[PDB]
C-alpha cells in the first residue's frame, strides 16, 4: 500500500531517515511486534499507541493505549471563533510557517 | 481586581516584563485602544482577539475576530482516546519538561 504519511525522529544525529506508514494501521509501542519498536525503552508501554488513516473520511488519527499517555504538540488555528486557553499555550498573532522571524507569539500561564 | 494570568512575548531581548491581565476581558489589536495594542503591525487586525475568564466557571478563552485568524500551539495530553494527527503536529511518545534528553518525539506529516 501506497505511503500516505511519513515520521520524524526528532533531535536524531545528522541523517536520520524517515518512517514511512504505508499501512492502514501503524503500531508503536515498547514490544518488538509493534510496526514502530522501542524493545530498550522502559517509559514507552508494550502497546503504546497507534496512528491510523480513515479510507473513507481520508482523516488521520493517533490513539493512545498506554498507562501513562502520549502527548502530541499540536498548532490550532481560530478564525472568528472562541477556543479554550491553558497553560503553557502559546498564542501567535502573527504566525509564518516560512518566516517565523515575523512571528509574534505571547506564552499564556493562569496566575490562580 | 487581582491579576488571574500573564503573557509573555517570545523571542525578546531578556528582561521582557509579562503582561498581568487584571481585567475579566482583556482585548488584543493594533488599534490604540486595546489592552494589548501593536499600532505599528500592519499584520495585526485593529481588534484580533480577546481573552476571557468566565466568572462563573474559571474557564479562560480566546475568542478571535481578526481578518486572518489567530494561531494557539498547543501541548495535548491524549490518554486511553483517540484524537486527530494534522502534517506539523509532534508526537511524543515520552515527555519530560525541561529533560528533553530522555523525549521520544516524532514530527508527524502526511503525503497525500
Known sequence: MQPWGRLLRLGAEE?????????????????????LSFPSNKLVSGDHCR??????????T?????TSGTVINKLKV???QTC????????YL???????????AYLYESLS
Open 15 to 35: 541523517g536520520e531517515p524517515h518512517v514511512l506508514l504505508r499501512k492502514r494501521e501503524w503500531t508503536i509501542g515498547r514490544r518488538r511486534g509493534c510496526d
Open 51 to 60: 496512528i491510523v488513516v480513515d479510507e473513507k473520511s481520508g482523516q488521520v
Open 62 to 66: 493517533l490513539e493512545d493505549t498506554s
Open 78 to 80: 481560530v478564525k472568528k
Open 84 to 91: 479554550p486557553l491553558q497553560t503553557g499555550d502559546v498564542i
Open 94 to 104: 502573527v504566525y509564518r510557517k516560512n518566516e517565523p522571524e515575523h512571528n509574534v
